[PDB]
Amino acid sequence: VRHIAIPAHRGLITDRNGEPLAVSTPVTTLWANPKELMTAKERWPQLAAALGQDTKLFADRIEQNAEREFIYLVRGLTPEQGEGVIALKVPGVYSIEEFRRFYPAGEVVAHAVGFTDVDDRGREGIELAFDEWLAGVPGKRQVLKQVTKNAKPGKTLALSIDLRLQYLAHRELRNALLENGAKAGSLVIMDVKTGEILAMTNQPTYNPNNRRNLQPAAMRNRAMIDVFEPGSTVKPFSMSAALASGRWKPSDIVDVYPGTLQIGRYTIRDVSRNSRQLDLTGILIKSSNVGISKIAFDIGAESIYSVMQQVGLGQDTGLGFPGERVGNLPNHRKWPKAETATLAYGYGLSVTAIQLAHAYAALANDGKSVPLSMTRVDRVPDGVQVISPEVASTVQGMLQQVVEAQGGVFRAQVPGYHAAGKSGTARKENAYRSLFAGFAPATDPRIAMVVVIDEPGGLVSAPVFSKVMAGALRLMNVPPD
Q1: Which of 160, 232, 423, 461 is catalytic?
Q2: Which of its termini does the chain have fewer beta carbons within 10 Å around, N or C?
Q3: What would be the CATH architecture of the domain defined by 161-207+403-481?
Q4: Are strands 13-14 and 157-158 parallel, antiparallel or unpaired?
Q5: Do you know which Pfam families this protein is assigned to?
Q6: Residue 243: CB partners within 8 Å, gap ≥ 6?
Q7: What superfamily in CATH does domain 221-402 come from?
Q8: Range(s) of the chain covered by CATH 3.30.450.330
Q9: Interior/surface letters 180-204, b for 16+ CB within 10 angstroms, e for the rest
Q10: Active-site annotation holds for 232
Q11: CA gap 395, 421 in Å, rounded
Q12: What string of H, E and C letters represents the secondary structure of the chain?
């Protein structure tokens, strides 16, 4: 008396609307006891041909494994072509009825969903992260040579992803990469109220249904793994600290002439050096490093560091995904002028696109952080007031200006709505990405979005934000403001 395991039916993964994303398909896997196959050697050429395997290679295998009384032959034939071997009716041949995964949306949602190994086990994305929920429990059968235990099936998992926004994201980031001859990219879309990831796309992608001759670059979940210095896209957090210090208001002026600022041996340089007096909105529109450095010297790094930590920058996302990088929000006891400045204009830390989008979500959600979710959120968690509604509101208005105002990013305007956001030029020898981070509608935000384009500056990312946001808001029947 022995025991064979009854494979469990892996739980169905859907998008937030119940569109199937990963499905357990019936297949049949064929084993054999050589000892018994040794008695029908005249059948081998027919068996081999019907397993695709070559005649002499096939007979080599069985002959050497003659001593053994178990080996697989082939895993994962269709049940229909699989019966075609049992239709040969050959002694020594018995069949296991297995499942394997189909991914109906294929490459569109490859990274978010991931895929299973040969054993039907999670290897990437959600498939790994929710392996235990999805796998269920093998059953157990006594083989003589009854059923000890029923197999319990994995449970259905409804992702936060909206496949319509995913299709849109995937298409538009694809277009943009070829339009800009760029190597790679990420686009994250978040529900600012619920912390739901509505879309996550990386280029290059792959077909999880056909992982033959798969490049490791294609498999990289960039949105969750690539870390970079966010540059100007974290200046709104530096400004949130400035406006919470009690020492700054939006109409305050900073003199950024002559576009450089000596701090001892170090020289802070602005990307454009055609300014003297700028208001706090101007500092953002111009992305003046001198502007934001001077404010930071006045309020202290501690206050900036604290806002940045509270919106999740360089923090664990709690998403439990396989390769997730955390980045680095570095701390000091004493913040010298150099480190204070570089933190404030966003070279003093490294983050993932998902972290940036989460931070933008907090700001867009009138300053309330909500934990990230890759699963459909039915009951919104309370989440944390990390920036005051009033400050959040002011910084929203300032970022709407960055998009609208003359001098501003006109290519990020969303036809129909008022959008808010900030471009930046990231640094991963010095690899450079174009970033755009923002939300809409500006006056009543619903959606936060980050666009990353590797080696296409940040006017590159902006038009993508434009077209993807327009679509996402319409698909969500958000009323034009």
Answers
A1: 232
A2: N
A3: 2-Layer Sandwich (3.30)
A4: parallel
A5: PBP_dimer, Transpeptidase
A6: 249, 250, 280, 391, 394, 395
A7: DD-peptidase/beta-lactamase superfamily (3.40.710.10)
A8: 161-207+403-481
A9: bebebbbbbbbbbbbbbbbbbbbbb
A10: yes
A11: 10
A12: CEEEEECCCCCCEECCCCCEEEEEEEEEEEEECHHHHCCCCCCHHHHHHHCCCCHHHHHHHHHHCCCCCCEEEEEEECHHHHHHHHCCCCCCEEEEEEEEEECCCHHHHHHHHCCECCCCCECCHHHHHCHHHHHEECEEEEECCCEEECCEECCCEEECCCHHHHHHHHHHHHHHHHHCCCCEEEEEEEECCCCEEEEEEEECCCCCCCCCCCCHHHHCCHHHHCCEECHHHHHHHHHHHHHHCCCCCCCCEEECCCCEEEECCEEEECCCCCCCEEEHHHHHHHCCHHHHHHHHHHHCHHHHHHHHHHCCCCCCCCCCCCCCCCCECCCCCCCCHHHHHHHHCCCCCEECHHHHHHHHHHHHCCCEECCCECECCCCCCCCEECCCHHHHHHHHHHHHHHHHCCCCCHHHCECCECCEEEEEEEECCCCEEEEEEEEECCCCCCEEEEEEEECCCCCCHHHHHHHHHHHHHHHCCCCCC
Experimentally, the structure was elucidated by: X-ray
Q: What tokens does 83 get?
A: 């019966």
Q: Which of 305, 268, 270 is nearest to 287 (CA)?
A: 270
Residue pointed to by tokens 């150099």: 338
